[PDB]
Design a protein around this motif. Structure first.
Motif, short mmCIF file in Angstrom:
data_model
loop_
_atom_site.label_atom_id
_atom_site.label_comp_id
_atom_site.label_asym_id
_atom_site.label_seq_id
_atom_site.Cartn_x
_atom_site.Cartn_y
_atom_site.Cartn_z
N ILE B 232 -1.44 8.22 -4.75
CA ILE B 232 -0.28 7.41 -4.53
C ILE B 232 -0.08 7.32 -3.03
O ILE B 232 0.07 8.33 -2.35
CB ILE B 232 0.95 8.01 -5.23
CG1 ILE B 232 0.69 8.12 -6.74
CG2 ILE B 232 2.14 7.15 -4.95
CD1 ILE B 232 1.86 8.58 -7.53
N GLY B 233 -0.15 6.09 -2.51
CA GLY B 233 0.06 5.87 -1.10
C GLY B 233 1.55 6.05 -0.82
O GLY B 233 2.38 5.60 -1.61
N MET B 234 1.90 6.69 0.30
CA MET B 234 3.29 6.92 0.65
C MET B 234 3.53 6.27 2.01
O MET B 234 2.97 6.71 3.01
CB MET B 234 3.58 8.43 0.74
CG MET B 234 5.05 8.79 0.91
SD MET B 234 5.21 10.50 1.55
CE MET B 234 6.12 11.27 0.25
N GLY B 235 4.34 5.22 2.05
CA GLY B 235 4.62 4.57 3.32
C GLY B 235 6.02 3.99 3.33
O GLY B 235 6.96 4.62 2.85
N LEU B 273 -1.71 1.20 0.07
CA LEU B 273 -3.00 1.91 -0.11
C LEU B 273 -4.13 0.98 -0.52
O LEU B 273 -5.21 0.99 0.08
CB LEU B 273 -2.91 2.99 -1.21
CG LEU B 273 -4.16 3.86 -1.33
CD1 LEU B 273 -4.38 4.44 0.08
CD2 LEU B 273 -4.03 5.00 -2.40
N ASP B 274 -3.90 0.18 -1.56
CA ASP B 274 -4.95 -0.71 -2.01
C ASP B 274 -5.34 -1.77 -1.00
O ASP B 274 -6.30 -2.50 -1.22
CB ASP B 274 -4.62 -1.34 -3.40
CG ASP B 274 -3.63 -2.49 -3.35
OD1 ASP B 274 -2.77 -2.55 -2.46
OD2 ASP B 274 -3.68 -3.35 -4.26
N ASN B 347 -11.18 -5.33 1.96
CA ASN B 347 -10.53 -4.37 1.11
C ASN B 347 -9.81 -5.20 0.04
O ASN B 347 -9.66 -6.41 0.20
CB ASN B 347 -9.55 -3.49 1.90
CG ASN B 347 -10.18 -2.48 2.85
OD1 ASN B 347 -10.78 -1.51 2.39
ND2 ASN B 347 -10.04 -2.68 4.15
N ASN B 348 -9.39 -4.57 -1.03
CA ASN B 348 -8.61 -5.15 -2.10
C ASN B 348 -9.33 -5.91 -3.20
O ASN B 348 -8.73 -6.72 -3.92
CB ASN B 348 -7.51 -6.01 -1.51
CG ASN B 348 -6.23 -5.95 -2.34
OD1 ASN B 348 -5.87 -6.91 -3.01
ND2 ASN B 348 -5.56 -4.80 -2.29
N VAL B 349 -10.65 -5.69 -3.33
CA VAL B 349 -11.36 -6.31 -4.45
C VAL B 349 -10.96 -5.58 -5.72
O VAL B 349 -10.44 -4.46 -5.66
CB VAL B 349 -12.92 -6.26 -4.29
CG1 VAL B 349 -13.36 -7.11 -3.11
CG2 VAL B 349 -13.42 -4.83 -4.16
N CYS B 394 -4.49 -6.97 -5.75
CA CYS B 394 -3.05 -7.25 -5.81
C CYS B 394 -2.71 -8.28 -6.90
O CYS B 394 -1.56 -8.38 -7.34
CB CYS B 394 -2.54 -7.81 -4.47
SG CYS B 394 -2.70 -6.70 -3.03
N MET B 395 -3.70 -9.06 -7.31
CA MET B 395 -3.48 -10.09 -8.31
C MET B 395 -3.78 -9.68 -9.74
O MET B 395 -3.82 -10.52 -10.64
CB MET B 395 -4.26 -11.37 -7.98
CG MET B 395 -3.59 -12.30 -7.01
SD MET B 395 -4.54 -13.80 -6.48
CE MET B 395 -5.88 -13.10 -5.54
#
Lengths: 409, 406, 405, 406
Positions: B232-235, B273-274, B347-349, B394-395
């Motif tokens: 889990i990305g934390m930002g 993160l993604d 990134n993000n594929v 993202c999609m």
């Protein structure tokens, strides 16, 4: 006891204010933008000038209530403190590894000291050593994270924002920026628990620090009891129409008012609160930011049983000052313009607060505007804008009238 | 059984959302108000989206379009009452138009209704009335927005608002209040739609009816990668108030053994993160070096000697070594983004199965390093969907995806 | 006589300052950004706080020169005035529809007023009724356009910026924003024609108002003569290496200096002048903003005969302070780090003489520490002059200051 | 035909354009802000979209000049290479310890190579290993400085900006910003030295690289020699009143124009250049952005021997559109308005000939309108080229376009 505000100029008898404090002590140049505050101020000097402001008002018989005193007093009643901590300290608010610890320590403090923290935020470092605290210490150390469990609220200083007394009642304002709803939490605690309110008689027209409100937002600087059954509510960035609409219905429903005059600020100038561009100084005298005030679209909203939602609203083609003038029975209002003839320099002398008809408190720096108020008959009592000023707020913004008499219109 | 058991596993069911009306309402003046980078070309965006959709279906993936799902959900009167009761109140529409917006919506044909719920409704869409007219008056003279119901162009990014984590799903409290309106729609869908109602799955965290305050979570930050682990990305958009709670629940149903909190540095806290770290194969990840090397990793585990039944340690190792060892691996094959012809962010594929990913046509270099490293890279057009900042990952909102032998 | 700045803490004898004036009378919230200035200030109250400043300096015996006064004595010399005007009033600045009027007019005014307009800018209303000034009023009324024949230059208040005195010569600074090079013009005129400069002995290390300096820019808060042939110079976003290199070369070439220590300011920080995160208070005592000062990369630039361009550069491994410490023959400099009650930024004080410094009253903490460190701190109000983003050190241009060793 | 542009809508005979290249390859999300670019673009697809556009004019007879091509040929004349280098490579621009290195090297390259670098900028890494490039690579390494000795010039692609042909001559425009001053130098060297330009008769109305100009700036988008001796110059943020009056004075002196109509725009700092809001599609046609054009304030500038500065400015009372039409000897101008299915902005098309423009495929609404008004709309892709805030017009520098009234 009857609490209520029935005008903008009438004799002021009870006003609530908040002096800068711990909150402002935590302002750094990087965090003042995301703590919703203009700049970093000299806190100890800002307190001294605020106290000067508080005293020039008290010296005149006005009852002046400082939020920190009320909060301190309110917090001693166990029930009151619990009502605030139950809603202020939650997993969702501080994190499940801190609620327990955070709460026990605040409860371990002397009343006054606690008020200061409820208003000025609480940092990781203020807690006694722990794992909870240390975990936060490293998120700041290693990721750059905020070290506030409970964020400061330097804007408490502008007691005008959070709540509004409109005749026999008050609104508990749903604040636009979510972090500022913590201020309403506290002023609501005071009004609900403190002895000066808990017994007093007054209506609650709109608001509830429990509900969510969504797009219904409302800010004090936008609301004004001018008397004669009228209320001026500015509608721009912070005061939405879904709020303004409910405040009206609620008021009409108890006969508090006969007309709500919605002052629509054009998108461009919509981040400005109404009392920032338009202020009263006497029964028929106002200061105005010309360029803006001439662009306001006035809308009259009044009671109507022929409608399901019991209201009627008509756009107005007469100018805002004309509508204001006519809603007070006057032929027209006299005007002093602030924000090029023989001005020696730019000043913005809007936002003075009336102590009674013809007596006003404003900033020392607005010499040129202040001079025009005196030639037009107003006594101008001044305070230093040096530190309070850097707040984007004046006398009017810094006062919250609770008891004010009306005038004959 | 519904559930996402890895990032690379064979994907069988995913939810997407094509651009539509919400994006037709974009203006260069309201981009930011609506939280959308730029004004895309809608008809062309819908075709590119449909192409993306079709390429997955051809691999036999069961692709569900958010509009179809909603349209079918709202045919159930009960489903619809649940939604309008929360979406059309005095607080969101103003007391003067609750009856006229509601009824009018209730009068439309189902598909048109779902288009409006996702795309917003302006003053002009409604029949002429007092209310409509004043809302218009506010637009004309004060420049005010005139949406009774605001558009949600970000629905196009189904990964954001809900997360399937093993035998369960999070109902994500969004950083921006505006976007919690999207969570309300997907919730209605998982609640009422047949595809979900009867199905077995846990609801790990979130609730469209509550105020979570400072708890916030965004899909891009979550990744159930397998081996009882969740990254889990934390930002900026996923807080510890939120993350801590997700972990506790996951651990309370044995749904997970450990959550690794990816601490994003303040300079990059705005990044999901993604969008800086993405899996392509059983051990292959594209990466944004700069950011990924600065992630501070935190291991979260169950601990009965904890008042909150959890334990936390800061991993001295790098984010990539920690992920590596969590999956029993040694090294992690890494392709870097951000010699090279130009700059490109690959990134993000999104994986459809091990070795098969969907990425954009524009990131050629990263695209060829992924084929060189053994990955089939299906490509979709970025010219419109990609202006929106988001990629294949993202999609898509993974609903059913198989596990991996780690 | 012989002018020259020979240290940062040595007895100060001659400083140039500039009082807030008509420039600031022209600040509006909708222009004080495009005119570069933190915010609109209370002008008359800033004049008083500045006069109080001049006073605290004069009474300690320092000769405080004032830009308006200095400018005024200067333009009384028709030659001096014709030199400034020939360069400030052209068709590329005023426009061909005004050059003869705007000029004819300025020339008909008394020196003290002409000078106020040169620093204060000139608006279309100011000019005598003419078809020219009126179409500009026109562009202001209808287009919301600036109606300024000549700019306001509010930053003249910070005299530290446009020129630097280094060991018996001066740098006429190439400024970053072109809309500030107008300042440098005026000061060049003063150093050229005023009696106190015309005849005095001194050099012009670098700089020239008639040239366009391209990417070479230089800002005074970045330049500090600290002593034995050493010069510190910050390298941020306002001081470029193309400029730092030519100043260094000229200095070496002329015997003027032995080493220039380039202060490498880190990317985020590179928006702060050196004297903002670092200042001297005594022979071996400085104030610093720790976060910044610990991250600055020092570079020694020395003269080299065997170099094609006469110089050699070595990145130092010692911290900025150890480097500066060693450069001064010291074992270690004491340090009061600033930036217990609240936040405060006590940096930017100006030494009047070793151990005596003038700072702002708001910075209680930092000054309290500075006094515990043996320094007598004279303070002035930051209320209005402080809304400028600069303190005592930014508001002074040392012209004569004794060495120390 | 001698060189000279005599209208906006007439037959197009010769134009100069500049395709994406090495400069756009240097764009990274962290800098495309300075260099004025909405985001990084896909360079090779951009190059194919540029060419395609070049091809659609080339096949219609237009002689299309390409800037890399012209610079390249121009470079081959040593004297011209000296002129440039002598001004682009100073101690003030590059620095004391790099002047010899950068030049010695640049001069080692082959013409097509040198031109590439001149426009695309030179970095530290491009130089031969040396102390001079290393002290420069050290600052980047430790302080985070830029790596550019010479900075990339991606805006070259918008050849409308740096120079304008107005009737029998041209202007060498002193650009507003910094990351654009360097462009005019290059195009000035082409006009001075190149064969097709060196030998032709034409006037230099205004401008000069070598001089400073102060607050006198002019940007092509604002200039339109619409024929009939009328020149239109938009007055805003990049076109100052000091440059405009000098331009009209030289034009009026050599009797090249009879009246210069200043279109003074209202304030905002968002730039917003006349052709991005007002464009000719036909002798009586024009595209307009209502919000802005109705706000323009017309000013007429005509010559006047009596007056001191041989011209007199009289503000106009009718609108910008009626004054324009009236200056053309027309009853009224027909207009297509831009910004009902989605938001559109079809201004900036470029006439190839009366009734034949070239615009973008994404603006289907405004294009249908334009075809309905009797105009043939040829289309190019905006996917990458319109990511740079410019369309056909910003991407063309007419050199030879016949007079209208045909």
């Amino acid at each position: 006891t009857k609490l209520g505000v029935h005008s903008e100029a009438g004799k002021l008898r009870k006003v609530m204010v908040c002096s800068p404090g711990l909150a402002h002590q935590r302002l750094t140049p990087s965090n003042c933008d995301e703590l919703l505050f203009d700049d970093v101020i000299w806190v100890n000097q800002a307190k001294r000038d605020h106290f000067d402001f508080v005293t020039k008002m008290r010296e005149r018989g006005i009852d002046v209530l400082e939020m920190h005193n009320l909060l301190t007093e309110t917090i001693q009643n166990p029930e009151a403190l619990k009502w605030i901590l139950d809603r202020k300290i939650t997993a969702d608010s501080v994190g499940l590894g801190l609620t327990s610890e955070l709460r026990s320590w605040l409860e371990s403090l002397e009343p006054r000291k606690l008020a200061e923290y409820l208003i000025g935020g609480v940092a990781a470092d203020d807690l006694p050593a722990s794992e909870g605290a240390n975990i936060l210490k490293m998120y700041r150390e290693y990721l750059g994270h905020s070290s506030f469990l409970l964020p400061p609220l330097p804007n408490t200083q502008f007691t005008r924002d959070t709540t509004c007394w409109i005749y026999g009642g008050v609104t508990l304002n749903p604040m636009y920026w979510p972090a500022r709803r913590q201020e309403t939490l506290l002023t609501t605690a005071i009004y609900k628990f403190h002895p000066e309110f808990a017994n007093a008689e007054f209506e609650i027209w709109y608001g509830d620090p429990d509900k969510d409100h969504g797009s219904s937002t409302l800010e004090g600087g936008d609301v004004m009891p001018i008397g004669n059954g009228v209320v001026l509510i500015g509608m721009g960035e912070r005061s939405s129409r879904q709020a303004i609409g409910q405040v009206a219905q609620s008021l009409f429903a108890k006969g508090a008012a006969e007309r709500v005059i919605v002052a629509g600020l054009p998108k461009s100038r919509a981040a400005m609160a109404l009392d920032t561009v338009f202020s009263f100084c006497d029964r028929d005298l106002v200061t105005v930011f010309p360029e803006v005030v001439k662009e306001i679209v006035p809308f009259s909203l009044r009671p109507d049983p022929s409608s399901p939602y019991g209201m009627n609203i008509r756009r107005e083609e007469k100018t805002f000052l004309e509508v204001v003038a006519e809603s007070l029975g006057l032929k027209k209002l006299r005007v002093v313009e602030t924000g090029a003839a023989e001005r020696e320099q730019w000043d913005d002398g809007n936002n003075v607060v009336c102590l009674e008809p013809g007596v006003v408190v404003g900033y020392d720096r607005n010499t040129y505007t202040n001079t025009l108020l005196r030639k037009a008959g107003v006594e101008v009592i001044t305070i230093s804008a040096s530190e309070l000023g850097r707040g984007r707020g004046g006398g009017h913004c810094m006062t919250c009238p609770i008891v004010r008499d009306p005038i004959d219109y």
